[PDB]
Design an enzyme around this catalytic site. Sequence first.
Site, PDB file in Angstrom:
ATOM      1  N   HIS A  42       0.723  -1.180   0.138  1.00 34.14           N
ATOM      2  CA  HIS A  42      -0.048   0.011   0.092  1.00 34.14           C
ATOM      3  C   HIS A  42       0.880   1.105   0.166  1.00 34.14           C
ATOM      4  CE1 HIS A  42       0.448  -0.150   4.540  1.00 34.14           C
ATOM      5  NE2 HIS A  42       0.479   1.053   4.200  1.00 34.14           N
ATOM      6  N   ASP A  86      -0.222  -7.427   1.423  1.00 30.24           N
ATOM      7  CA  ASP A  86       0.160  -6.017   1.533  1.00 30.24           C
ATOM      8  C   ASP A  86       1.885  -6.092   1.815  1.00 30.24           C
ATOM      9  OD1 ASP A  86       0.266  -3.510   1.579  1.00 30.24           O
ATOM     10  OD2 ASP A  86      -0.550  -3.326   3.492  1.00 30.24           O
ATOM     11  N   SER A 177       3.054   3.763   8.622  1.00 34.17           N
ATOM     12  CA  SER A 177       2.906   2.236   8.380  1.00 34.17           C
ATOM     13  C   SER A 177       3.978   2.156   7.391  1.00 34.17           C
ATOM     14  CB  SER A 177       1.610   2.004   7.522  1.00 34.17           C
ATOM     15  OG  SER A 177       1.572   2.928   6.371  1.00 34.17           O
ATOM     16  N   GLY A 178       3.956   0.635   7.182  1.00 36.14           N
ATOM     17  CA  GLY A 178       4.858   0.077   6.136  1.00 36.14           C
ATOM     18  C   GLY A 178       6.184  -0.421   7.009  1.00 36.14           C
TER      19      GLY A 178
END
Length: 223
Positions: A42, A86, A177-178
């Site tokens: 994402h 993801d 995130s990530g």
Amino acid sequence: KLVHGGPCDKTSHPYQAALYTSGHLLCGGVLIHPLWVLTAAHCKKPNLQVFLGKHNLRQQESSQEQSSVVRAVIHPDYDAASHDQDIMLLRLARPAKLSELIQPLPLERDCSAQTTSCHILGWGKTADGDFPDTIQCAYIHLVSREECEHAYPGQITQNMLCAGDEKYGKDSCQGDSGGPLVCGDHLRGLVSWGNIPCGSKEKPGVYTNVCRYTNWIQKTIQA
């Protein structure tokens, strides 16, 4: 207080990467090989730039020592609506030169690993103001798959895992995130969706289940 500490006391996190697009810090990531950074699918954007061995970063970050991404490989079965699978591999323009400040994090290869005490990392501003982004660390625990499925009915696949803490993170849960979920000093997850980056026990964070991807990661890197 020497050693009496843990990961969240660390001044440096050598495997934490920052991903930039058009001068803005978009996501975190994890160095897993001198030529590859792992992050969430994402997080895909054009002309990604990566910063390794950083502690504090600003918008339009001037402090060079950046590396352009020359290939981005999103998992071919990534589904944006569900966020299933993801994950994305980013190939750096040059191999990272490993040092005290830059080191890869080994992947958890065993989906049945028993360690449930973990920490997460994310880029954020410690408190309301305008100071630079820094690495926010918090302690959390894995939550059983059945508990995960009960919090997010019909939305949790085998390619996801849940984690959180009744305290609601670790009184310092700012962050994007990530980035990594680290359990037993191995990469266990990537911050994906839900109540992130720190969830509670009844509304946990959802993370990509990295142990599922070790073969795909190997195939891609060795290609």
